[PDB]
Amino acid sequence: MKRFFNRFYLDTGIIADPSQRSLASRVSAFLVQGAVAFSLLGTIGVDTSPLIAAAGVTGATIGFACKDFGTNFVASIVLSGQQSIRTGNLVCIGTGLNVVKGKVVDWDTRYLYLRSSEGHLLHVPNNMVLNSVVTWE
Amino acid sequence: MKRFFNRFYLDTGIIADPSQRSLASRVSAFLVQGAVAFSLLGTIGVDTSPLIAAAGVTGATIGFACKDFGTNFVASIVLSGQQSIRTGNLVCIGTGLNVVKGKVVDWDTRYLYLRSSEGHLLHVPNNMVLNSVVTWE
Amino acid sequence: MKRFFNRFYLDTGIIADPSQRSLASRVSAFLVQGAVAFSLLGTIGVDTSPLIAAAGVTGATIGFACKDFGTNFVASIVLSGQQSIRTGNLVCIGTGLNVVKGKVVDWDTRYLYLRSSEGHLLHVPNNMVLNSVVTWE
Amino acid sequence: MKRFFNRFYLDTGIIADPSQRSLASRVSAFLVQGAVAFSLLGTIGVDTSPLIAAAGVTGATIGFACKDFGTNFVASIVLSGQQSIRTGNLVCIGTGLNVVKGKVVDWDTRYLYLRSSEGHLLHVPNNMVLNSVVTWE
Amino acid sequence: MKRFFNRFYLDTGIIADPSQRSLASRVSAFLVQGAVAFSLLGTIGVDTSPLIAAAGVTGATIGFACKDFGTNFVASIVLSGQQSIRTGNLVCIGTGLNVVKGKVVDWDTRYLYLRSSEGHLLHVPNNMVLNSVVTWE
Amino acid sequence: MKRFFNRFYLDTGIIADPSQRSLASRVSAFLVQGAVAFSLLGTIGVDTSPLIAAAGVTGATIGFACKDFGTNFVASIVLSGQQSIRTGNLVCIGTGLNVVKGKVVDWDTRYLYLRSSEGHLLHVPNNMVLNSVVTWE
Amino acid sequence: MKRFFNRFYLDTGIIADPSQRSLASRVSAFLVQGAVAFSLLGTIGVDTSPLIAAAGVTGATIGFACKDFGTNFVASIVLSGQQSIRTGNLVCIGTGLNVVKGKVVDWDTRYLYLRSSEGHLLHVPNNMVLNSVVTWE
């Protein structure tokens, strides 16, 4: 199932990094196999309610802890092909005092990289770029 | 079921982009078929509680990760036909220091495009336009 | 059931726009019929748990995506007959830097329209009007 | 049951407006009768799970949409008999730039009315009055 | 059970006002009796699922509406015996522009009362006092 | 079970105050005994669903009301042994206008005590210290 | 199971501190053993619903109390190998008035340590570093 999940992720373009793709495929295959095993165990008579409750609590806690990571990942997925965030573009994110200006040099799954006028590297989170006023110059 | 969902989305006007319409139709058809298959499996005696719990946890996590995307999409759906956000209109979004001014050039499902006095392109999120004071001039 | 829901909405005054009333009546009739059909299917032995879980997840996601729309609609419903927001009244919403001033020209289910001293049209969301200090002059 | 709910609301002082009291009594009687009918239907064998799920989803959505209305109503209920918010009192709500000053002229279930030095009428929400620094002069 | 709940509340010091103690005892006794009655009804065969769902929805809505009241009550309970908030003490709550200064004159279950240099009475919510920088002078 | 819970809390270092330790041990023993009694009652045939629903609603409301207290307690637990917050250290919490400066004199489970240059005592909540920029001098 | 969990945590790199690794292994082994014991008890006929409800409520309350700790831990896990946060690097976190500048001296699982121009030690939370504009110089 790992190969199937890797193929699905590669085809859909959700995940592009090979290491991240392998990790996600392993995790998804393990989760699906565990769910199938729990269903099979519950079919024959074993009470799966405590196991389901514990697994659900652990999964909810883990997903709530990784909220920012997930949000940044989704923002990076959505913003792809924006036609305004490209290499060499002079973009400006923010309005008012909280303003960020620079030239796009690289894009990541967690940060958007800009080069300032003084040569500094600016790490703008993708979630910040999503919920802000991007100014293309 | 893909054709039925595509027809429903096209008729209701919820989704207009053909690629987005096809993707949404495929996803909805797959989800409905999976729910029907799970119900059929649970009818004959298979314990579907672990599968339901896992699918619900995954769906909740995915929907919570795409919160901003969904909010922007809904805002773009609602704001359609505003009679104030039209091509060539001089609108101004915001009050105080966080102010954005320009002329509407194009509308998207994720951003509202304005042209500044200096010629810059402003990408205002639809969610920002919804919960703000739009000033038509 | 569509006619019954339309009559109920018209009598209670919750919805006034005929197009919105027809859409809401259709949606409510479809939802009630679907719930009745699911109950009937579950009576005869079909396991309705996966269908209920899927429908609940979809409904929760849709309702959470339309949070701002629902809030604005409820605010417009509540603020009706305020005796202070009337045509020709000089109202002022907000305190401090985030201040909005104008004369009320029209009311909508999504925006409150004011005319500035310079002639601009101000679109103040109803949710903003609810949770703010309205200053009648 | 409408008369019983009206008597309970009048005696407890939760609701004072006769129209609001009648509406709340009707709604509560209808809800209790519906719950009793659903329990009776489920006793004889009818699967009430889809109906319960649909009713719960609708009630949760409605209650979440009316969050601000409910909060203001509860604040108005709690603040009653404050001994500081009385007719003719010179109160001041807020600290810093977001300050509101005036003389109390009337109290409502949604707004607190103050008269400014220039004669303007200030509509301060009860929720704002609850979570703020009231300054009695 | 009303007397038992009154004794428990008085001994634990959670509630000190006799009227509030009587109201809380009545409410708790009614709730416990209702839960016992529902359990007894469900034992003999009556389907209690709709009643439980309705009661839970109503209780959740009521508890969410009284969020600020509950938070202030808990803050007043916790802050008791602070050794810094005493009669005649010159305390200062807040940092920056949102600053409040005065001498403590009285304590309530909803507000903390201070006397300003000009003689004004300041009503500082207990929740504000909890999540702020108290400056004892 | 009270002695067992007291020993566990003392060994793990979660709770250090003897009065708080005794109260927590009593509460935990009562809760565990109640859960065991409810399970035993449900084994013999008594429908425990209404009792479970009522207890869960009450516990959720209580835990949500004590959110700030719990957060401060957890922050005090985590920050222990920081090697930067010690007696006599000149620390500075905050950035910008909301800045607090002083010398650490004492630590509590609810506040962090600092002595200002003018001799005032500053009560900084532990939750504030956790989510802020501490500046050791 | 403690050794298995320790090996898993060490191999995945989620936890690096040996004391934290041992504590997490003990906690995970205890939780899994408890879930298995509850499932076994529920298989033979014992009603595990009250125990599951109590354990779930306690776990939810504990996880919600440790929200900031979990968020900081996840941020520290994610930010590892940033290639911009290294020893001796001159980084600047924040935009506007809330700005922090210094040279990285050490990294922790709860704070990021910077040395100011005046020699002060700055404790920047990892969650703050995640959701901010890092400026590498």
List the domain boundaries for chain B: 2-65, 82-136
Q: List CB contacts of E49: < 8 A, sequence separation 6 or more.
A: D39, D42, D48, D49, D52, F49
CA–CA dist E63, D70 (Å, integer): 11
- Topology of B82-136 in CATH? SH3 type barrels. (2.30.30)
CA–CA distance, E111 with C8 (Å, rounded to integer):
44
Search chain C and give the residue with CA nearest D49: C39
Share in percent of chain A as helix, strand, coil (round to 5): 55, 20, 30
Is residue G110 within 8 A of residue G71, CB to CB? The reply is: no
Alpha-carbon distances, residue F121 vs E113, E116, E130, E135 (angstroms): 20, 19, 16, 6
The answer to whether the beta carbons of residues F129 and F75 sit under 8 Å apart is: yes
Contact E124, E107 (CB under 8 A): no
Q: Cα angle at C134 between C128 and C135, to 5 degrees?
A: 150
Interface test with D, best of C15, C67, C95 (most D CBs within 10 A): C95
Taking contacts as CB-CB distances below 8 angstroms, the residues of chain A near B63 are none
List of chain F residues whose C-beta atoms are within 8 Å of the C-beta of residue G51? 35-36, 39
- Way it was determined: cryo-EM
Four-CA torsion E66, E70, E71, E75, nearest 10 degrees: 160
Q: Is E135 helix (H, G, I), strand (E, B) or coil?
A: strand
Q: E123 and D134 in contact by Cβ < 8 A?
A: yes
Give the C-alpha separation, G13 to F83, whole Å. 26
CB of G55 closer than 8 Å to CB of A62 = no
Using the Cβ of E65 and the Cβ atoms of chain F, whether some distance falls under 8 Å is answered with no
For residue A87, which of A100, A103, A99, A76 has the smallest C-alpha distance?
A103
CA distance E121 to chain F (A): 23
Query: Given CB atoms, is F69 within the 8 Å cutoff of chain G?
Result: no
Does C touch B (3+ CB pairs < 8 Å)? yes
D123 sits in the region (left: phi over 0; alpha: psi -120 to 50; else beta) called beta
CB-based burial, B21-36: b 16+ in 10 Å, e otherwise: beebbeebbebbeebe
Is F57:E56 a contact under the CB 8 Å cutoff? yes
Give SS3 for E105: strand
For C31, the 3-state DSSP assignment is helix
| Amino acid at position C114, single letter | L
Chain G (18-47) residues lying within 8 Å, Cβ to Cβ, of chain F = 45-47
Residue F97 buriedness (CB in 10 A; 0-12 / 13-18 / 19+): exposed
Please name the amino acid found at residue G59: G
Handedness of CA A33, A39, A43, A49 (dihedral sign): positive
Quick check: C65 and B42 CB within 8 A?
no
Reply yes or no on domain G84-136 having CATH 2.30.30.60: yes
Torsion-angle region of residue C28: left (phi > 0), alpha (psi -120 to 50) or beta?
A: alpha
Residue C82 tokens, joined: 């305020």
Are B132 and C125 inside 8 Å of each other by CB? Answer: yes
Q: How are the residues of chain G apportioned to helix, strand and coil, as percentages rounded to the nearest 5?
A: 55, 20, 30
Q: Do chains F and D touch (3 or more CB pairs under 8 A)?
A: no
From chain D, pick out residues whose CB is under 8 angstroms from the CB of E53: 35, 52, 55-56
CATH number of C83-136: 2.30.30.60
On the CB side of E95, how many CA atoms lie within 13 Å of its CA?
A: 19
Of E65, E110, E121, the CB nearest to D70: E65
Cβ neighbors of G4 (< 8 A, separation 6 or more) are none
> Across the F/G interface, how many CB contacts are shorter than 8 Å?
91
CB F55 within 8 A of CB F99: no
User: What resolution in angstroms, rounded to 1 decimal?
Assistant: 3.2
Residue of F nearest to G73 (CA): F78
E 94-113 residues with CB below 8 A of F? 95-97
Distances (CA, A) of C117 to C104, E42, F6, F48: 12, 67, 70, 66
d(CA D53, CA D86): 46
The residue among E126, G125, F79 whose CA lies nearest residue A68 is G125
Whole-Å CA distances, A87 to A103, A131, B110, G83, G95? 8, 21, 21, 20, 23
Hunting for tokens 């009739």 — which residue is that?
A: C29
Burial class, F18, CB count within 10 angstroms (exposed 0-12 / middle 13-18 / buried 19+): exposed
Rg (CA), chain D: 20
- In chain B, whose CA is at the least distance from the CA of A95? B98
Chains with 3+ CB–CB pairs under 8 A to E are D, F
Question: 3-state DSSP call for residue G58?
Answer: helix
Q: Looking at CA atoms only, how far is residue B75 from chain A in angstroms? A: 13
The answer to whether D and A touch (≥3 CB pairs < 8 Å) is no
Separation in Å, CA D54 to CA C53, D59, G4, G66: 11, 9, 45, 34
Residues C9 and C1: beta-carbon distance below 8 Å: no
